[PDB]
Amino acid sequence: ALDPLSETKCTLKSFTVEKGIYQTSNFRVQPTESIVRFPNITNLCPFG
Amino acid sequence: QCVNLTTRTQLPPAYTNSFTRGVYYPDKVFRSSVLHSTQDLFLPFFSNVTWFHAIHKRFDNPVLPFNDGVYFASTEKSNIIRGWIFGTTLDSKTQSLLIVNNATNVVIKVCEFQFCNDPFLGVYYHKNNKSWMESEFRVYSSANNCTFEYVSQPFLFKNLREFVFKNIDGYFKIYSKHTPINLVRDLPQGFSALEPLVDLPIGINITRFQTLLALHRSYLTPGDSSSGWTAGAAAYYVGYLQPRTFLLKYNENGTITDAVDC
Amino acid sequence: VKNKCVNFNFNGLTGTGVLTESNKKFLPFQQFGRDIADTTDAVRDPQTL
Amino acid sequence: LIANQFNSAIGKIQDSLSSTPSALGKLQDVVNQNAQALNTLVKQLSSN
Ligand SMILES: *[C@@H]1O[C@H](CO)[C@@H](O[C@@H]2O[C@H](CO)[C@@H](O)[C@H](O)[C@H]2NC(C)=O)[C@H](O)[C@H]1NC(C)=O
Numbered sequence: 001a002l003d004p005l006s007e008t009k010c011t012l013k014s015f016t017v018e019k020g021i022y023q024t025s026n027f028r029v030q031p032t033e034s035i036v037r038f039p040n041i042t043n044l045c046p047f048g
Numbered sequence: 049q050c051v052n053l054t055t056r057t058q059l060p061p062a063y064t065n066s067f068t069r070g071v072y073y074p075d076k077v078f079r080s081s082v083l084h085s086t087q088d089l090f091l092p093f094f095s096n097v098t099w100f101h102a103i104h105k106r107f108d109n110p111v112l113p114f115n116d117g118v119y120f121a122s123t124e125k126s127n128i129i130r131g132w133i134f135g136t137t138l139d140s141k142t143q144s145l146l147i148v149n150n151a152t153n154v155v156i157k158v159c160e161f162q163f164c165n166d167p168f169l170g171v172y173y174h175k176n177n178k179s180w181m182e183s184e185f186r187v188y189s190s191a192n193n194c195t196f197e198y199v200s201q202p203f204l205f206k207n208l209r210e211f212v213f214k215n216i217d218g219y220f221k222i223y224s225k226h227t228p229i230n231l232v233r234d235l236p237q238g239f240s241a242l243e244p245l246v247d248l249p250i251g252i253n254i255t256r257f258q259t260l261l262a263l264h265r266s267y268l269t270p271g272d273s274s275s276g277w278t279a280g281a282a283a284y285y286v287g288y289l290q291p292r293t294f295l296l297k298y299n300e301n302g303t304i305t306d307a308v309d310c
Numbered sequence: 311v312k313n314k315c316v317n318f319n320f321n322g323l324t325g326t327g328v329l330t331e332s333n334k335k336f337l338p339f340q341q342f343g344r345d346i347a348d349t350t351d352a353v354r355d356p357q358t359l
Numbered sequence: 360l361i362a363n364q365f366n367s368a369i370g371k372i373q374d375s376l377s378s379t380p381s382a383l384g385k386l387q388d389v390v391n392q393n394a395q396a397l398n399t400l401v402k403q404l405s406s407n
């Protein structure tokens with residue numbers, strides 16, 4: 001986890017990388033917030 | 049008050065084919081241009097649908113056996129059919145479903161009523177007031193320990209009212225679709241999709257169902273309220289849902305336009 | 311919040327994604343849509359419809 | 360004569376390709392198969 005070349009070296013498990021294009025990891029956008037939406041209620045349940 | 053009155057003519061009921069009728073939205077999921085196959089309690093195409101008449105004299109309201117799901121259709125303009133009553137005993141021993149839809153309200157009260165053996169609703173009309181009002185409410189003797197209550201807006205031989213009543217998992221589901229019908233004696237061959245109206249959570253054992261009709265004695269009956277009455281014309285159809293796999297075709301707007309009985 | 315990668319749970323349907331104003335026309339009893347391969351891709355808000 | 364026959368043959372070939380939606384099936388099959396497989400894979404996510 002230093003730079004893409006080192007990640008390629010780790011993915012190939014070798015210290016020497018031949019010329020080419022290699023897939024190393026997956027890029028994914030992590031969520032930022034949380035959203036809750038539910039119908040309007042104003043009365044508690046009769047658990048009493 | 050309970051009244052047991054029968055002056056109708058005796059003749060065996062008629063039978064018809066159900067045709068491509070009685071298809072409802074199985075779920076509340078929107079789909080566009082997708083052919084979706086489901087396995088639900090559907091009405092087989094061209095099924096053996098029973099026909100009941102209420103001509104003027106016929107008032108046949110038998111205790112039909114409500115099997116797993118029941119299809120029901122009506123073409124009429126006098127609003128003779130008001131509601132339906134369900135139950136295993138139709139007695140004050142066990143809870144019985146009861147629905148009444150007159151012109152003014154829809155009433156659902158799940159109570160174990162002491163049902164009269166001949167439930168009906170009586171409407172009397174006078175010329176001076178020019179109003180049709182219901183004098184006698186004799187579908188049951190008394191309220192008798194209601195356990196569920198619900199009232200909503202009324203549902204509105206030239207109009208077709210198609211309902212599907214299905215009881216599963218302690219829930220009583222009603223699917224209805226109002227459509228203008230031009231023919232006055234038989235179901236049209238057109239395809240119609242029934243949208244859900246309400247999932248009333250009743251959860252009672254139901255084995256036998258009945259329909260509630262209304263009389264319209266205004267001035268043509270001279271007899272007592274035990275053998276004499278008069279009303280209009282009504283016809284209704286009863287089918288039975290079976291476990292069926294159906295291929296439903298959704299258009300781009302999300303409404304079912306075609307179906308296939310596998 | 312719209313146009314952001316956010317978690318959500320609308321009437322029990324829980325997921326992660328970006329919510330955008332749509333042009334689909336739900337019938338006034340359906341709650342959410344689905345794809346050809348049964349994938350949730352549209353949800354009606356339980357408050358603003 | 361040979362040039363006219365060649366030209367007529369090319370024209371007939373174009374007409375046959377245009378007025379027959381079953382000549383290119385060897386390609387369509389492949390596409391369909393791939394799509395079908397992908398669909399099946401995705402639908403396998405909805406199994407208990
Ligand atoms: C719901 O009510 C029905 C109708 O009474 C019950 O089914 C009956 O079960 C008895 C058992 O002794 C049979 O003799 C009857 O023939 C059945 N009737 C029918 C129409 O099938 C049913 O058992 C009840 N459900 C539950 C869960 O108790």
Ligand SMILES: *[C@@H]1O[C@H](CO)[C@@H](O)[C@H](O)[C@H]1NC(C)=O
Pocket residue numbers: 063096
């Ligand atoms: C419908 O029921 C009637 C009862 O009289 C029977 O004669 C007829 O064959 C039935 N039709 C079917 C099962 O398709």
Ligand SMILES: *[C@@H]1O[C@H](CO)[C@@H](O)[C@H](O)[C@H]1NC(C)=O
Pocket residue numbers: 152153199
């Ligand atoms: C209709 O509505 C009211 C309110 O539920 C109810 O009390 C009343 O009895 C109904 N009217 C008739 C004529 O049954």
Ligand SMILES: *[C@@H]1O[C@H](CO)[C@@H](O)[C@H](O)[C@H]1NC(C)=O
Pocket residue numbers: 140141160192193
């Ligand atoms: C009504 O009330 C009581 C309480 O549930 C019940 O035991 C009784 O049998 C019911 N009676 C009738 C007539 O429905």
Ligand SMILES: *[C@@H]1O[C@H](CO)[C@@H](O)[C@H](O)[C@H]1NC(C)=O
Pocket residue numbers: 299300301
């Ligand atoms: C969907 O509804 C619109 C309303 O503008 C209509 O123009 C269109 O034809 C409908 N589509 C189908 C497939 O019925």
Ligand SMILES: *[C@@H]1O[C@H](CO)[C@@H](O)[C@H](O)[C@H]1NC(C)=O
Pocket residue numbers: 040357358
């Ligand atoms: C509350 O919900 C109602 C019904 O959907 C809506 O008309 C109203 O604007 C809402 N009020 C808010 C969100 O403050």
